[PDB]
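Model the whole thing, not chain by chain.
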Amino acid sequence: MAYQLYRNTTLGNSLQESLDELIQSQQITPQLALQVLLQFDKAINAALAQRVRNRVNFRGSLNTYRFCDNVWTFVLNDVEFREVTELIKVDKVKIVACD
Amino acid sequence: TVPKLYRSVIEDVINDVRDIFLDDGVDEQVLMELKTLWENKLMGQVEEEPLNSEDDVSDEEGQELFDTENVVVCQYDKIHRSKNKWKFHLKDGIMNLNGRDYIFSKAIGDAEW
Amino acid sequence: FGVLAKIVNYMKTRHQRGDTHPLTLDEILDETQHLDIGLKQKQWLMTEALVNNPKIEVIDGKYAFKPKYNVR
Amino acid sequence: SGIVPQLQNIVSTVNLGCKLDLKTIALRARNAEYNPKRFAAVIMRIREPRTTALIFSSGKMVCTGAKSEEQSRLAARKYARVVQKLGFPAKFLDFKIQNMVGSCDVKFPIRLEGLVLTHQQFSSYEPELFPGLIYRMIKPRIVLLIFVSGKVVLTGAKVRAEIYEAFENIYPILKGFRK
Amino acid sequence: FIQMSVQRIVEDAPPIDLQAEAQHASGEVEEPPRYLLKFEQIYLSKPTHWERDGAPSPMMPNEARLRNLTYSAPLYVDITKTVIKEGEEQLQTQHQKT
Amino acid sequence: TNYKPVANHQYNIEYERKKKEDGKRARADKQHVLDMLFSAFEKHQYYNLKDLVDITKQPVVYLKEILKEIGVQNVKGIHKNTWELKPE
Amino acid sequence: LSTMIGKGTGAASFDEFGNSKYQNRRTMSSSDRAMMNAFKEITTMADRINLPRNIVDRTNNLFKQVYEQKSLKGRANDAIASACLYIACRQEGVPRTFKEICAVSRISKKEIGRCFKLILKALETSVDLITTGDFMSRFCSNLCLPKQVQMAATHIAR
Amino acid sequence: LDLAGPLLAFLFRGMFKNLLKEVRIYAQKFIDRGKDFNLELAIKTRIIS
Amino acid sequence: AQLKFFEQLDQIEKQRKDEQEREILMRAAQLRLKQKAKEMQQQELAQMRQRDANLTALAA
């Protein structure tokens, strides 16, 4: 019962796998696992909002886009993420945005 | 840098879940075991009704099914488009490019359709 | 308590089905996607308060026959 | 006259004959967007015809951006086929061209002041509101935006014949006010 | 009258206090903004007549007699408007010679 | 300087910007609207339609239809005839 | 065809808890009350920029014709009144810019212009095109420029 | 003896009170709506004159 | 388990003391009633907040 964005990332996947292992071991109940996920979502949202103070840029081309329930699902190709300190090249990217 | 932010996030998460672990009556050792496993895992057609007259008018839908490529999840403040181009004021979020993770506060983007 | 009025609406649609039979609270809570814990106990305290004023009839035994006038 | 207007946008409405789920269409379609707070329909774009269509839950769809009648019909059919591929019983019923927009140049500056003085019954020139003169032709129900640079934009037409006839009517009048 | 009484009448009038009637039905911890208006420093111009064109011009008394005009002078007041929205900031905009 | 020519008054542009950003209230599904209505009623027994519209954040016509389905208007000595969220 | 009643004398006029005039007089119909409010708004707007009373009367007549014609019944009253004021100024030969009318009216310039177009269509009339010389007198006087400067500016623009 | 000054002062007292009353009413409407009323529009110039 | 029942009885005494040890602070300037009222208010927000979660999971 929260924003639930970072669950489908490396961090959320690792947390979910750990919770699955404890559930298999019966150490934690699924309700406790869900509560842990909710608290993680709150904490991660706050942490990114507060402790991140860097500005990034990127350019490229767009191949697809979708919008529903205030959820953008852009799909770009040949993107160049440009930053003052470093530049990164990617063949394709999917940008999921919410608010 | 990013690992240090990850460790700070670990501290915040454990502090945030302590109260729930007390509320549900579960012993605190669960949090230690969770952190251990989490760290280990990380590191003329007059009759026009038939639409079959045209075919292959779409593209491969497997990109969204795969999602294996690089993925960026963030929040958007303003998104404008003027007849050709899509413009992006994406605010603080996370990016997963080539496995390595990137963290940002302000993201500006211009794309063509 | 709002979920309780929603249960009342559910049993009203149940009357609309015409298959009204003596029931209980657990099966309704299951079919309405709600659980059976101490929450059901406090809402059952509210539900008995309802049984003190159930113009929509909710009796304890064989029940739910709301309509003060009812033949078919 | 030697000048023919070229169409810049065509608006066509077609009924699919079946109710639709806007949320499902937004979730499953490729380029569709749905913001019920902003607008009650679903906005979708296809690049090959280079058009945009609005799809409503009532089953009626509006296609805009097509440069030709054939392109408009093909784009509407493509949108209907996309909706049908999403599992809905979409059809192609009472397709009609509601409005057409054309543009052209007369290749000479025009004195809009004299034009509005001569044709005040049909002309409306308000530089405060809009620099272009608005001419409301009667015999064809066409609205023409005439500019001092000579560009003329015609709108409100149902068929290309109306666009061409309106330009043919307006051209001698404009030639009378060449700067 | 003009030099003292008009200014004193302006200053004697109590400041206008205005606030919304619990707008938005939110927590409403003094959330409705408070608008305070205070009139000050009245100014009088010389007698002036504005034509059909709207161009101001001095009005001679004989012209007032001939054209049945009224010999009057514009009256201007400085007004200070303060907005208190309980946002921890109060802004006091000043309107000059209203 | 008084009554200087302006294209649009400042307060009006601010109000229009706020309204545009907020947007029109969307018509949500019947189930969620009903659940929100029932919780609101749980707060206490009597609600006015205006504040109920504020609470539900739904179109007035759609909310009125859903409320007419279950709730009933009672003429009362509180101030006026208002809605009753109890179905019976 | 109405009257109204006052307090009168102090005796039986006020009753059990101060009944007043037995009542409040409660006169008229909306097809006249709305027009009356529009007339009041027109006078206020005109006095804001010191428009003469003849322009006010022409505005009132234009508003009566528009209001009875009823093609602008969906448009808010104040917009109609502001557009009528603009049209009356144009017909009297002393045009005020749309921004000048918006400065004294709560209605925005865009809405005033739209109602102006609609009123022109409803009345089946027209207004002479504005020229640079129309605004020279007011602009120069508000800038307090000399008469020679005003003449020079008018000649330069023409 | 009440000369021109005191009499006009009495009248101006009354009319300035009326002007402030009208400003109060006009601004209160807009404040209830949540718009930030313009002071120049609130002032009804005709009252005093 | 019997010891856990005794700890629950102690938590019940602690909640009574906290509610009453200041139902008195309010008087010096009903605490339990206020807490209950506060809990009642959240329910509506929680669900309006909550079902968004269900649709966002479907969306992503």
